[PDB]
Design an enzyme around this catalytic site. Structure first.
Site, PDB file in Angstrom:
ATOM      1  N   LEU A 105       0.811  -1.700  -0.216  1.00 21.93           N
ATOM      2  CA  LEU A 105       0.048  -0.130  -0.035  1.00 21.93           C
ATOM      3  C   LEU A 105       1.280   1.652  -0.105  1.00 21.93           C
ATOM      4  O   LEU A 105       1.628   1.622   1.135  1.00 21.93           O
ATOM      5  CB  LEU A 105      -0.701   0.237   1.044  1.00 21.93           C
ATOM      6  CG  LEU A 105      -1.726   0.986   1.046  1.00 21.93           C
ATOM      7  CD1 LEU A 105      -2.594   0.611  -0.210  1.00 21.93           C
ATOM      8  CD2 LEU A 105      -2.588   0.966   2.731  1.00 21.93           C
ATOM      9  N   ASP A 106       0.936   2.074  -1.180  1.00 20.08           N
ATOM     10  CA  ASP A 106       1.823   2.834  -1.397  1.00 20.08           C
ATOM     11  C   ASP A 106       0.853   4.066  -1.468  1.00 20.08           C
ATOM     12  O   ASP A 106      -0.081   4.294  -1.599  1.00 20.08           O
ATOM     13  CB  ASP A 106       2.354   2.785  -2.715  1.00 20.08           C
ATOM     14  CG  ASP A 106       4.020   4.201  -2.773  1.00 20.08           C
ATOM     15  OD1 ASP A 106       3.691   5.023  -3.006  1.00 20.08           O
ATOM     16  OD2 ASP A 106       5.159   3.826  -2.128  1.00 20.08           O
TER      17      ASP A 106
END
Ligand SMILES: Nc1ncnc2c1ncn2[C@@H]1O[C@H](COP(=O)(O)O)[C@@H](O)[C@H]1O
Ligand SMILES: Nc1ncnc2c1ncn2[C@@H]1O[C@H](COP(=O)(O)O)[C@@H](O)[C@H]1O
Ligand SMILES: Nc1ncnc2c1ncn2[C@@H]1O[C@H](COP(=O)(O)O)[C@@H](O)[C@H]1O
Ligand SMILES: Nc1ncnc2c1ncn2[C@@H]1O[C@H](COP(=O)(O)O)[C@@H](O)[C@H]1O
Ligand SMILES: O=P(O)(O)OC[C@H]1O[C@](O)(CO)[C@@H](O)[C@@H]1O
Ligand SMILES: O=P(O)(O)OC[C@H]1O[C@](O)(CO)[C@@H](O)[C@@H]1O
Ligand SMILES: O=P(O)(O)OC[C@H]1O[C@](O)(CO)[C@@H](O)[C@@H]1O
Ligand SMILES: O=P(O)(O)OC[C@H]1O[C@](O)(CO)[C@@H](O)[C@@H]1O
Ligand SMILES: [Mg+2]
Ligand SMILES: [Mg+2]
Ligand SMILES: [Mg+2]
Ligand SMILES: [Mg+2]
Ligand SMILES: [Mg+2]
Ligand SMILES: [Mg+2]
Ligand SMILES: [Mg+2]
Ligand SMILES: [Mg+2]
Lengths: 327, 327, 327, 327
Positions: free
Chosen positions: A112-113
């Site tokens: 999850l960036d």
């Protein structure tokens, strides 16, 4: 003919006469991504806030969207029976898969960036890169330290106004939109090609005081163009995946170069820079540190960082030329 | 206790002893927002790409996300029987509701804000301002020309990583997360106050060449702080509903001033600036053109533009001071 | 290890060293089923009822859930590039697939069964059977007229309180629950085996006056058991798919035998009787007309009808014995 | 105009000049129903089978669909602040709401009816009856012992192929379809009337041996009509909410009389029989024990049982006549 991501990966595997393992893997990724999108969009959040009291969870049980994403990717990739080493931005050491579950692929991924945009609900995403294991050596970190040019597959999912998964392989880049009504990614753009020359520049100008002379000169020229045309627009979401996707779709240039806090750059080579650089090159765009191609750096640390400039060929080369001029 | 928007709205209605007409209106508006949220997230898009056959819609004559949003909002709000005049970005004229559906409220909205972001899948949202009809004459466009100070309620839905409705009324501002698994908005932040001071600034630096000297000076302070403190970070999503919501939740400043190029600014007074200024003031922020409070302008055209600078009160006050010192 | 229907079909195809075509097909079916479940549950119905006015659809455009289901199956199976002949309960003639899209499989299917329970919201489903084409003859109806014993695959989806897809192949029956949050069918029961002897009997007793002596004697014995034990419970939903699923899960007996309106029975051999008889035999249960095995009838008409008794071995044989006693 | 349950409820509130407390209550109840509908359809079940890891819940200690339903209903209704006493099938005693949440309404519900159908995935539902507290003393279980004639509102949600809420109040009965894509109930049948006479009969014929002679005689008329007209068809789902809803929409009769075996019948007076009898009468049907109107019984235990025979007025009147003729 409507084409779902499932049919497409399967038909590509059949064209390539794969044994199915890579197919299994991509299907895994595609499921894990759905699982992520759904948690990202807050389904079931009424339970967090006591719609039914509190008796569902025991002692203490919850996950942050970052930890949850990480577990989803790990477990779903392991169940594919296709992987040997995973690298996550969340784990300090490479993860070696148990032999009973071991396939021949190496996956580097950002589960999850864009985490500075989580609490404010701005677009975030998942970034992934896949390698074939070279060696016959007992799997180890070394199998992750491959340059980007050796990727088989890479891409990202963007959790934006809608959820999109972009996938690049040897023959190009295809975009698929998640239809959340049926859980299918629907191919919506085939053979995506980046405009030669954009009209948008995307960087955090907050570090203006620590840029090198070439970034500074380029930025200036975006605002005050010598030829007197309309200045580039600025756009910086603060999530690499969104800023990079806009870049691909609209054209333009994205930059995260060196600064004092990060002399070697901020973004990670394996799971942030390399995948995005592979998508970009397959789409006819460029990806440079300023000094060399990103996909050519042979990494020596799974959490290595690198400076990154990417996007349309004429915009990036224009920047490289400034670099070549100052050196 | 879990608190849904529907319950909150309804209690607020009974405390104030409303006839029920405005509550009716707010329930409508919450219904419109869930319907737009679903279209935006792309449910049933598989139908558009021929999954059940009938694959001649490929040259798209069918309606865009923004035409759909508009139709929902106009339709769900007439059906509330609580309104007499609506102004929508997408309509060059004020809509006068039929006598048999007439109610006493005037509504200004931008059914889908962030259209340049529509394609690239970046956050987009919906913005609304509600007023009371003072006038006793036939309802008409002049009924929507009441300064922002007169708002009874205003707010916005962000379609981001998740969908949030933020609603401000006389006694302050609350944030409700949409749990799309049951189509309820859940209260998650009660009585929201922005922080005195941020460390983010948000402006399209592409126009640097058209910026008035105060903007130019402020931007310089943000990058090269004279007192050598940390430089502000920069963020510009390019959707007002997103930059604004980040400003609200993380603190800092958001700017859309007049450039030389477009002298009254770009953002619209009635359904972009007013509702946001009202949310910001109700939350402890400020909202100024540089010379005056946004909410105090007497509008003269329902599509009039205004420059807007909004957010943390120390960060806006500091810019205000530059404008003065520029006498 | 969580196992999705996708991974499972793919892993089974790999065990069987298939070329992928059957895999592609099953993936198609699994997508079409999701598409059906979602329309069955009424998503998007607010558009039918003018949430946004009426301007979406043109001239006249709508579908009944029966026609929609049929289009979904046809188009999705054709896109699989795996089929040569389809038989639908909705089409009077077998459908021959265009050569550019032609694979080697024959699929008989009921796109939405239980139509007398549609307007009252009771459980309905989809029933399917798959054959390999035998011949090298130009594809034709003849390829559908295979007995049930030659099925490769068969099963049904049940749109009940939740959506379940049951799939039988050579080695047994597995059940998968549709998680509508992510669009994955999740294997929830492996190697399903029907109880030897149930305690539920399921028939429309409305035709009591037209049953044969054996049905009549059996029914009586269900109510007044000679051995004096507790009588079987009755259960008749009126949808073959629900009544048959309960039978599988709970044990017991399901009957649709001959009546005056239907001397040869009501239910269709190809897409109602045969698939359900194959699931039943793989699960260790029985399926008889009263006189012979269902899977052994060689059909001569794609819309042929047959009487059907199926369920737990001791209950069905008990009924066959009555038949053998009266003859 | 599209009409949602929330809007309808709210207008009904203003016509009657309610303080808002009961509307509050009905909005709550509609919220509970959407939450149960989602759990029932199995969203997020992939989490239960280990998709994000942590796969020690396999020996299930976690709560069943019925314990969840119960908790939602009790919790969503206390949070309405509109009730003082609740009776739930799943609680052996009346629940007395805390003074600080007390309101004036009493509620009887069966949070999930059709438990024998839970496993096999057949329709199931939720049933509720609402009364006013007459008494001025401390609220107590006696407050829920008011005959069905006193109902202010009653109805049920069917979780079938789709989810429907049917709501009956003083002026008749309306049907609202849940569009799960936006979590609104949409009005689809206004002011529903059952037909004078049906051609369906619904009873568990498994108990034929315990049936009183009037039931036995009526059943015989349905199969062997003395006047040689068409025999009635038979349907028994075995979920009361489903058989009843079919009866409402298609006409006909539903029976759960006393067998010799269980002399007061099986169905519960307060939260099964009463609400359904009230829906039926409000719709033009009848509801009798065989000897008296259901709604006129003075309950003496909140878990008391009653025989119930309900549905088309000609079909019930005919049975009533057999009971009399059996003097
Ligand atoms: N689904 C697929 N899409 C694209 N290339 C594939 C696919 N499957 C296999 N290949 C190519 O074939 C190689 C061997 O596949 P595998 O036998 O599955 O490990 C891969 O490393 C890919 O280059
Ligand atoms: N649901 C509500 N929330 C907050 N204020 C309300 C509400 N309903 C009514 N009011 C206040 O009461 C006034 C008159 O209500 P109404 O008669 O419904 O127009 C409104 O203009 C509001 O100021
Ligand atoms: N996914 C699968 N599951 C079970 N059996 C399969 C699968 N794929 C292939 N087979 C078996 O292999 C045969 C040839 O497969 P195909 O080459 O795909 O037509 C089929 O007719 C099946 O008996
Ligand atoms: N939403 C509503 N729908 C129908 N009747 C209502 C509603 N609200 C109030 N009433 C009638 O008005 C009475 C008092 O309302 P309340 O003060 O809200 O308890 C109720 O017992 C109902 O008979
Ligand atoms: O706030 P900064 O330093 O501009 O960095 C934001 C960047 O950092 C990251 O969050 C690191 O992953 C990227 O997603 C994004 O581009
Ligand atoms: O590209 P520009 O000029 O910065 O415009 C971006 C602005 O325009 C708008 O799309 C107009 O609504 C705003 O949402 C946003 O702030
Ligand atoms: O009303 P009847 O004659 O009992 O038949 C109902 C049967 O007919 C069918 O609808 C025909 O497909 C089956 O689904 C079901 O078992
Ligand atoms: O198996 P039986 O005795 O017919 O019981 C079925 C009845 O029991 C119940 O499940 C009890 O609520 C009803 O829903 C249904 O009508
Ligand atoms: Mg991360
Ligand atoms: Mg990252
Ligand atoms: Mg707009
Ligand atoms: Mg706008
Ligand atoms: Mg059919
Ligand atoms: Mg059928
Ligand atoms: Mg119950
Ligand atoms: Mg019950």
């Amino acid at each position: 003919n409507i084409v779902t991501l499932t049919r497409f990966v399967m038909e590509e595997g059949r064209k390539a006469r794969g044994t199915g393992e890579m197919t299994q893997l991509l299907n895994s990724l595609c499921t894990a991504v759905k699982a992520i999108s759904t948690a990202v969009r807050k389904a079931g959040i009424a339970h967090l806030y006591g719609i039914a009291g509190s008796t569902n969870v025991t002692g203490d049980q919850v996950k942050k969207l970052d930890v949850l994403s990480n577990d989803l990717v790990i477990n779903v990739l392991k169940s594919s029976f296709a992987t040997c080493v995973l690298v996550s931005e969340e784990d300090k050491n490479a993860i070696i898969v148990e032999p009973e579950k071991r396939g021949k692929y190496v996956v580097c991924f950002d589960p999850l960036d864009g985490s500075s945009n989580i609490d404010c609900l701005v677009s975030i995403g998942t970034i992934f890169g896949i390698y074939r294991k070279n060696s016959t050596d007992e799997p180890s970190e070394k199998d992750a330290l491959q340059p980007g040019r050796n990727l088989v597959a890479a891409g990202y999912a963007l959790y934006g106004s809608a959820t999109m998964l972009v996938l690049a392989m040897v023959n190009g880049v295809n975009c698929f939109m998640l239809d959340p009504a049926i859980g299918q990614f629907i191919l919506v753009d085939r053979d995506v090609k980046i405009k030669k020359k954009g009209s948008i520049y995307s960087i955090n100008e907050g570090y203006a005081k620590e840029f090198d002379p070439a970034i500074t000169e380029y930025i200036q020229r975006k605002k005050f163009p010598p030829d007197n045309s309309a200045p580039y627009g600025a756009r910086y979401v603060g999530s690499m995946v969104a800023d990079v996707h806009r870049t691909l779709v609209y054209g333009g240039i994205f930059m995260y170069p060196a600064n004092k806090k990060s002399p070697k750059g901020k973004l990670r080579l394996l799971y942030e820079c390399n995948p995005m650089a592979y998508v970009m090159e397959k789409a006819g765009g460029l990806a440079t540190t300023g000094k060399e191609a990103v996909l050519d750096i042979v990494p020596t640390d799974i959490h290595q960082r690198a400076p990154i400039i990417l996007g349309s060929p004429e915009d990036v080369t224009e920047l490289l030329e400034i670099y070549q001029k100052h050196a």
